């Protein structure tokens, strides 16, 4: 009743399209197809008697489910939409190599991978183990910086426990690429707690033997030292909604869909839509870190056909800039650990953000806001600008303080609170940064300087209060 393809970097074929969506209109309970933050998509809602079709349904079209809950490599990211569009292709092919190489090895915990292309941070590496920001010199790859060690799960109280960003280890040429994944997952594989298993994860066993003992047992490993790292900034983390122009003819169409949630609505079909799209479009679609749709490689001749559709099926609807940089998990009905309403929250939660931003003279700014609905943090709600973590049924941990670019931990504001106490909480904050702030300064980074919230400087140390 729960069903997650493997699909390296999102990218899926409009044949393989098709049979997605044909199953999940036959052959499941709640008829949809749900894109999650890892750049792949679910079925809700499995009959036994489809199980095994399922499978052999994503065979016939060269697909492959993951296991959900084993311990091993989950999907592997890649940037979506690289502002230099030309290194898409070769960040694919090493996001895809990387994750054959890690197939089946056998983890302390579930590991998880990203290839990233500066200046977007969309895949949110921070949440990741095993990072691999990519080094270009006149629009070919030449290495990855190595970030290790991201991972933001929870248990709520229990403060032996944390959110922890990732950790630079330093620069390797392209040709090591492999040897120092292997590496790492080996080394992780053997230093692991394997007792508990709320420790198990790379974050925990970093802070346990120290970065510069792991870096160089990964050194020894792969038969190499890394060098200095290299120069990369970030500038963002959202998506590029609507048409951007790649290289030569080609086209790409960004659709946002909240929640990533595909079904036919009142007045927004948005499955069959997709659907029809799929029937003629030339190239093949992208599944996005933040849950929405690239219909890509559009040639310029067919782009007028495609935003028809798209725009008839209400896949176009304009949202505000603060409902595209919102995010919240899957949570009920589907989640048998959620606390807290998270997917289903979120849009009514955003329509009062959205007055309270008009409120204030900002509707044309965002704040990186989530929901997830346990602390669990699927929802990457401890990468957040504003971040609430469910607790129990309407109410939330509301945290402050992370930055746009999601290279710092938020820390909790207020615990255990419900939506009025939240937006009235927001509601006198916004209000202090619209009048406050410093020129192009974030909400976030705000809270900080103004001493509204105490920075997590040293999360396996000063995370909680
Ligand atoms: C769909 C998704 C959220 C979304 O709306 O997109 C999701 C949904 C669930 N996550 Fe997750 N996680 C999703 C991204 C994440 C990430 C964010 C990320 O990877 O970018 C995290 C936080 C980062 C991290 O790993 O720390 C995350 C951390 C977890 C955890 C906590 C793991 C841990 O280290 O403690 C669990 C529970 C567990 O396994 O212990 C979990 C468990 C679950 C399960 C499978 C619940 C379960 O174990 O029974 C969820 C299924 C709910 C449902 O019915 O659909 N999910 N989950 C994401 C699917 C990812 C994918 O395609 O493979
Ligand atoms: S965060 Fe807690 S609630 Fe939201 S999906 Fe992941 S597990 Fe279910
Ligand atoms: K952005
Ligand atoms: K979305």
Same mark, same amino acid.
């Given at each position: 009743?729960?069903?997650?393809?493997?699909?390296?970097?999102?990218?899926?074929?409009?044949?393989?399209?098709?049979?997605?969506?044909?199953?999940?209109?036959?052959?499941?309970?709640?008829?949809?197809?749900?894109?999650?933050?890892?750049?792949?998509?679910?079925?809700?809602?499995?009959?036994?008697?489809?199980?095994?079709?399922?499978?052999?349904?994503?065979?016939?079209?060269?697909?492959?489910?993951?296991?959900?809950?084993?311990?091993?490599?989950?999907?592997?990211?890649?940037?979506?939409?690289?502002?230099?569009?030309?290194?898409?292709?070769?960040? @694919?092919?090493?996001?895809?190599?990387?994750?054959?190489?890690?197939?089946?090895? @056998?983890?302390?915990?579930?590991?998880?991978?990203?290839?990233?292309?500066? %200046?977007?941070?969309?895949?949110?590496?921070?949440?990741?183990?095993?990072?691999?920001?990519?080094?270009?010199?006149?629009?070919?790859?030449?290495?990855?910086?190595?970030?290790?060690?991201?991972?933001?799960?929870?248990?709520?109280?229990?403060?032996?426990?944390?959110?922890?960003?990732?950790?630079?280890?330093? @620069?390797?040429?392209?040709?090591?690429?492999?040897?120092?994944?292997?590496?790492?997952?080996?080394?992780?594989?053997?230093?692991?707690?394997?007792?508990?298993?709320?420790?198990?994860?790379?974050?925990?066993?970093?802070?346990?033997?120290?970065?510069?003992?792991?870096?160089?047992?990964?050194?020894?490993?792969?038969?190499?030292?890394?060098?200095?790292?290299? %120069?990369?900034?970030?500038?963002?983390?959202?998506?590029?909604?609507?048409?951007?122009?790649?290289?030569?003819?080609?086209?790409?169409?960004?659709?946002?869909?909240?929640?990533?949630?595909?079904?036919?609505?009142?007045?927004?079909?948005?499955?069959?839509?997709?659907?029809?799209?799929?029937?003629?479009?030339?190239?093949?679609?992208?599944?996005?870190?933040?849950?929405?749709?690239?219909?890509?490689?559009?040639?310029?001749?067919?782009?007028?056909?495609?935003?028809?559709?798209?725009?008839?099926?209400?896949?176009?609807?304009?949202?505000?800039?603060?409902?595209?940089?919102?995010?919240?998990?899957?949570?009920?009905?589907?989640?048998?650990?959620?606390?807290?309403?998270?997917?289903?929250?979120?849009?009514?939660?955003?329509?009062?953000?959205?007055?309270?931003?008009?409120?204030?003279?900002?509707?044309?700014?965002?704040?990186?806001?989530?929901?997830?609905?346990?602390?669990?943090?699927?929802?990457?709600?401890?990468?957040?600008?504003?971040?609430?973590?469910?607790?129990?049924?309407?109410?939330?941990?509301?945290?402050?303080?992370?930055?746009?670019?999601?290279?710092?931990?938020?820390?909790?504001?207020?615990?255990?609170?419900?939506?009025?106490?939240?937006?009235?909480?927001?509601?006198?904050?916004?209000?202090?940064?619209?009048?406050?702030?410093?020129?192009?300064?974030?909400?976030?980074?705000?809270?900080?300087?103004?001493?509204?919230?105490?920075?997590?400087?040293?999360?396996?140390?000063?995370?909680?209060?």
């Amino acid at each position: 009743m729960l069903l997650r393809c493997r699909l390296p970097g999102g990218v899926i074929t409009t044949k393989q399209w098709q049979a997605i969506d044909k199953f999940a209109g036959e052959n499941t309970i709640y008829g949809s197809i749900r894109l999650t933050n890892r750049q792949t998509f679910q079925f809700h809602g499995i009959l036994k008697k489809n199980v095994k079709p399922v499978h052999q349904m994503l065979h016939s079209v060269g697909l492959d489910a993951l296991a959900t809950a084993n311990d091993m490599n989950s999907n592997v990211l890649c940037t979506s939409n690289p502002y230099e569009s030309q290194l898409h292709a070769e960040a @694919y092919e090493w996001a895809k190599k990387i994750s054959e190489h890690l197939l089946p090895t @056998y983890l302390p915990r579930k590991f998880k991978t990203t290839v990233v292309i500066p %200046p977007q941070n969309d895949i949110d590496l921070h949440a990741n183990d095993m990072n691999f920001v990519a080094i270009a010199e006149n629009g070919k790859l030449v290495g990855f910086n190595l970030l290790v060690g991201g991972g933001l799960s929870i248990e709520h109280g229990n403060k032996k426990t944390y959110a922890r960003t990732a950790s630079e280890f330093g @620069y390797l040429p392209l040709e090591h690429t492999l040897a120092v994944a292997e590496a790492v997952v080996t080394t992780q594989r053997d230093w692991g707690n394997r007792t508990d298993r709320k420790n198990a994860k790379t974050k925990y066993t970093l802070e346990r033997v120290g970065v510069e003992t792991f870096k160089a047992e990964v050194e020894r490993r792969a038969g190499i030292k890394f060098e200095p790292i290299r %120069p990369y900034e970030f500038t963002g983390r959202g998506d590029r909604i609507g048409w951007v122009k790649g290289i030569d003819d080609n086209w790409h169409l960004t659709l946002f869909i909240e929640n990533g949630r595909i079904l036919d609505y009142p007045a927004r079909p948005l499955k069959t839509g997709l659907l029809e799209i799929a029937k003629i479009h030339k190239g093949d679609f992208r599944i996005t870190a933040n849950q929405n749709l690239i219909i890509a490689g559009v040639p310029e001749s067919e782009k007028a056909k495609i935003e028809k559709i798209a725009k008839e099926s209400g896949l176009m609807n304009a949202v505000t800039p603060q409902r595209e940089n919102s995010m919240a998990c899957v949570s009920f009905p589907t989640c048998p650990l959620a606390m807290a309403e998270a997917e289903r929250f979120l849009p009514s939660f955003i329509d009062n953000i959205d007055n309270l931003m008009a409120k204030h003279g900002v509707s044309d700014e965002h704040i990186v806001m989530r929901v997830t609905g346990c602390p669990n943090g699927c929802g990457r709600a401890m990468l957040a600008e504003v971040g609430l973590v469910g607790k129990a049924p309407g109410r939330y941990n509301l945290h402050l303080g992370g930055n746009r670019i999601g290279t710092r931990i938020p820390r909790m504001y207020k615990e255990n609170i419900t939506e009025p106490e939240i937006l009235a909480s927001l509601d006198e904050l916004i209000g202090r940064w619209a009048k406050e702030r410093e020129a192009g300064e974030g909400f976030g980074d705000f809270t900080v300087r103004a001493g509204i919230i105490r920075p997590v400087l040293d999360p396996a140390r000063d995370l909680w209060d």
